[PDB]
Amino acid sequence: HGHMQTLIFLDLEATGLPSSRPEVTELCLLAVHRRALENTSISQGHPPPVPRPPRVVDKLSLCIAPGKACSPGASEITGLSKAELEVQGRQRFDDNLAILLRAFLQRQPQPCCLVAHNGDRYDFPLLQTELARLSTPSPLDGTFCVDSIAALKALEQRKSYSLGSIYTRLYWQAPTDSHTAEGDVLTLLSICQWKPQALLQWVDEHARPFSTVKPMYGTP
Amino acid sequence: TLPHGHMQTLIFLDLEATGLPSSRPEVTELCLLAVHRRALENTSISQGHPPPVPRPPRVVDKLSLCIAPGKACSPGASEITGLSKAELEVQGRQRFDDNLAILLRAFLQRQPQPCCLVAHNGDRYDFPLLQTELARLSTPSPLDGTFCVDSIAALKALEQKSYSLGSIYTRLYWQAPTDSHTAEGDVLTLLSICQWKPQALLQWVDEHARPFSTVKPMYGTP
DNA sequence: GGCCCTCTT
DNA sequence: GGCCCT
Ligand SMILES: [Co+2]
Ligand SMILES: [Co+2]
Ligand SMILES: [Co+2]
Ligand SMILES: [Mg+2]
Ligand SMILES: [Mg+2]
Ligand SMILES: [Mg+2]
Ligand SMILES: [Mg+2]
């Protein structure tokens, strides 16, 4: 349990929204030691400048071929499609991907905590569903997770708690590369660099094992 | 298809208590106002800006009880509710006890089933508190088989801003509520807010009603 | 799809 | 009724 040593910012892109029984099309992890986060110094400004990511970070970004077509809306905003992913030789969500995730997580200082925007309702349940289809034991065993919407709400102290709304509320600039996995992870990181010590305290208190996350859907 | 069928009775509920959740509060007052769904189906459409406060239905069952808590009220609680443990006892009020459970069961039992409790911030206060108080008793729960919904969630859906009871009431009707922080007063205020868009409320309630047995107690007890 | 709706005394 | 995720 806490204190959490590493925060792993997570974002998934997929074929659609949960009622559609979606499948992952892109995945990004950005791992940062809690020290790098608290070391961030939001410079003077009105609006405050967007902080640079810490120098020392681990990053993984992967495109994934789904077993079903993206919804038109999902394709439009992500810039991905099943057809393009296939011709670019992307592989399905498979055992080897699970091995990659575990190895990546395992070289992070422990314990780790996944951080995703609306994670409790989307990213974590969806990820649980994808992993459940595999033969590998869950690569996220021992890993914790929190939802940054819950975090940001509690840290205050609004019309919207969407990723973009929060970012703009803080920095009054548009996020870049929205609805791309890496783009959204970097945006989330910038938000979480605003008041890192308060965030880390909240994370330490509210982090729960990823293994407690119920799958989005069950594929009986 | 509706998850639990039509809710035939809406039971507007409010509690007064010794304090707020972190204090392990105990109930000091309880009011139930039971209304057949038809009384809501029969409520007039709210027209005008502002509309008048809806007329309460003629046919209603009401229960309002003052209850001696097991601990003193916080000074803040006493100030706003006008109740204190000592004075409730001077007035000979009984504790939240087996008798009360039997009373509540009988009251609910002559309502058409199923019943759905409606309380403002009920999901985070009234329902968990009531669950805790009933859990203390050896008597079986009189609320098994009943459903519940939070009217904050309801009014947010219906309004499509503060969502305190008084704020909503004032926003809809341009009037100050009366007898705030009394159980019966707040129940009548709640009734009025829920009568604003009565057909839409009923549909939302039917869609979001959840079994009371799924409500987690506010706090644990020896 | 599931839960949240920051108020409650 | 819509968040909020795609
Ligand atoms: Co679409
Ligand atoms: Co009937
Ligand atoms: Co209506
Ligand atoms: Mg996302
Ligand atoms: Mg994204
Ligand atoms: Mg109340
Ligand atoms: Mg009250």
Numbering used by the authors:
A (entry chain B): 8 to 164, 174 to 236
B (entry chain A): 5 to 164, 175 to 236
What does the paper say about this structure?
The structures of TREX1-L-structural dsDNA and TREX1-Y-structural dsDNA were solved at 1.7 Å and 2.0 Å resolution, respectively. The nuclease activity of TREX1 was enhanced in the crystallization conditions of the TREX1-L-structural dsDNA structure. In this case, the input DNA substrate was digested by TREX1 into 2 small ssDNA fragments, including 6-nt- and 9-nt-long ssDNA (6-nt-long ssDNA: 5′-GGCCCT-3′ and 9-nt-long ssDNA: 5′-GGCCCTCTT-3′). The 2 ssDNA strands then hybridized to form a duplex DNA with 1-nt- and 4-nt-long 3′-overhang in the crystal. In the TREX1-L-structural dsDNA structure, 1 asymmetric unit contained 2 TREX1 monomers and 2 ssDNAs of 6 and 9 nt in length. The annealed DNA strands formed 2 duplexes of 1-nt- and 4-nt-long 3′-overhang, respectively. Each 3′-terminus of the DNAs displayed an L-like conformation, and for both duplexes, the 3′-overhang was inserted into the narrow active site of a TREX1 monomer. The Leu24-Pro25-Ser26 cluster of molecule A capped the 5′-end of 1-nt-L-DNA via contact with the last base of the nonscissile strand. Leu24 and Ile84 in the narrow pocket of the active site in molecule A also stacked with the last nucleotide at the 3′-end of the scissile strand as in the TREX1-dI-T-dsDNA structure, indicating joint actions of the two structure motifs for removal of the 3′-overhang. In molecule B, however, it was a groove composed of Ala161, Leu162, Ala214, Gln217, and Trp218 on the other side of the Leu24-Pro25-Ser26 cluster that contacted with the 5′-end of 4-nt-L-DNA.
